[PDB]
Structures are given as C-alpha cells and as structure tokens.
Amino acid sequence: KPDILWAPHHVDRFVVCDSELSLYHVESTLRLSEDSAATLLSINSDTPYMKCVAWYLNYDPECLLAVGQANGRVVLTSLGQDHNS
C-alpha cells in the first residue's frame, strides 16, 4: 500500500513509499501542478519490501521517517544529507 508523507516541519517536502523510496521538495512553477514543479532530493532503496512506516515528532533530526522490514528488522534512515544530524 503505497502512500505519500509530508514533512512535519516542511509543507513543501514531498515523499513517496514504493519499492525504491524517493523524496522531492515542492518548488513553484516533475510537474505536480500548473504552477508547481516537483524536484527530487534523494532516492534510496535501503529498505526493500517495506513493512511499516512511522514518523518522528521531533524537529531534529530532520527527514525522520521510520522503515521496517518484513522480518521485523526496522531501519532508521534520514533522507537529508546530514553528516551530523
């Protein structure tokens, strides 16, 4: 069941949940809308065949979305290129 998640602190951050996860940031004008353009930020497939999706309430660290495996092995990855999140 694919779904799109929005950042808790950013209303212009777009996400997608599929076999290879991808993230995009909304920029005014892919062509999301007539006056909107979609530009991807980071696409990673570190958790193939996703099981459960969760998000963190805390502002930091950013790009905090939870990824779990079919065997119950959860992966906690941050999409933003943060050397010191």
Q: Which residues of the shown chain bind a second copy in the complex (CB under 8 A)?
A: 20, 39-48, 75, 77-78, 81-84
Q: How far is the CB of 48 from a second copy (least distance, A)?
A: 7
**Is 19 or 34 the residue whose CB approaches a second copy more closely?**
19
**Is 5 or 22 the residue whose CB approaches a second copy more closely?**
22
Q: How far is the CB of 25 from a second copy (least distance, A)?
A: 8
Locate all alpha helices (DSSP H) within the chain, ordered by sequence: none
Handedness of CA 60, 54, 18, 24 (dihedral sign): negative
| Cis amide bond preceding 61, omega within 30 | yes
23 sits in which H/E element: strand 21-28
Residue 27: closest CA among 19, 16, 37: 37
Q: How far is the CB of 34 from a second copy (least distance, A)?
A: 20
